[PDB]
Amino acid sequence: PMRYPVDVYTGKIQVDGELMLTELGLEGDGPDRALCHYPREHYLYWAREFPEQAELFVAPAFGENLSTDGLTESNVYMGDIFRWGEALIQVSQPRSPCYKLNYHFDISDIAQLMQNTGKVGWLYSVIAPGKVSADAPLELVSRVSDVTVQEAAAIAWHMPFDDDQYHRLLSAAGLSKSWTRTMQKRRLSGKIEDFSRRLWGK
Amino acid sequence: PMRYPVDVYTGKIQVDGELMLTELGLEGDGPDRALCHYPREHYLYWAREFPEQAELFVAPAFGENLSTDGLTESNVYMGDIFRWGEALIQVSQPRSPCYKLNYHFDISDIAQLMQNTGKVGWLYSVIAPGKVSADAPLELVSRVSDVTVQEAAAIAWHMPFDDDQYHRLLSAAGLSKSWTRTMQKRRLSGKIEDFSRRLWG
């Protein structure tokens, strides 16, 4: 039963107190995307990649609510349920990188790079609202799937069209509504949707 | 491909024009329970069970939005995705019987009996909003699970405590938030929640 200590941030500013996790997110901050998570470890990577702006790559530069060390996309699975203090949360999707990040860091291809590396983080849906805190760690209570956030990112963005793999992703407990809609549409249309608008803003 | 004709009803009155299906349900009518489905076959059963009120047991007596013939809880699966006209919908849970039905039929134990038989029908979540109609059938496009609605009802209500079977249910694609919360809580608490308040008041 590993515990992952969490640094919390809301509208973005570090929080030390006890606070309330509602169905719609933490107080002061849709239901499938109420909580953003980014692995603190990835900052080291970005800093190496862009030395002359290493000072920009610290939490919560990527807009995250939860910052941790020891959880990454390859050891966190779709549908995973974690207890956090009094609340329950479930992994709903990988976070899709967005062009707005490029302007936030004033680096032209960050979003593209995030997507390519798969160092994107994940969003939660809140299964039970409750009292939470910075001093209360995450604890995995149910793993109900075999698809790691990493694999979900790969199915989404790295692989050529594979109906079988979309079927697999659609079978993942907790999958967000948008990702269900996106993947189902691929299966029916036979086409992978455009990423350009999301990634560049052009 | 097998496609299922459907009678629609919106709060209940039979609609047969086109109408818009939204994230929050049909136009005129939470996101996990936007669409209620009940199999038309069950009415025959209820009529036999309560002969002196057989006239009450016709669609949409059980409040359903969708009425069909050929789909039942043993051949519909958790997480199933169906195309309906222009929209996409996903099976999210068995419908939980409620005491209000007892007053609707003015028969004292209908909800309890529904739960016990497992003749409960199911709710959908709306994956894509779109134009729908009575003249547009349901078509199964993705089956992503091995838990039938029947099995989910049994895990819920018919079985003694079985952590393994709750794990199984928590692994079902599309499972509603409330059922996820309910089943997770069983696993942590070691206790099956009370049904009485829901079944009676």
Residue numbers in the entry:
A (entry chain A): 0 to 10, 25 to 42, 52 to 224
B (entry chain B): 0 to 10, 25 to 42, 52 to 223
The authors write:
MOSC proteins play a key role in the Moco-dependent reduction of N-hydroxylated mutagens or prodrugs as a final electron transfer enzyme in the nitrogen-reducing system. To provide insights into the catalytic mechanism of MOSC enzymes, we report two crystal structures of YiiM, one from Gram-positive Geobacillus stearothermophilus (gsYiiM) and the other from Gram-negative E. coli (ecYiiM). Based on the comparative analyses of structural and biophysical data, we present the common and distinct features of YiiM enzymes and propose the putative catalytic site that is located at a reactive invariant cysteine residue. Sequences corresponding to the β-barrel and N-α-bundle modules of YiiM are conserved in MOSC family members, suggesting that the two modules form the canonical structure of the MOSC domain.
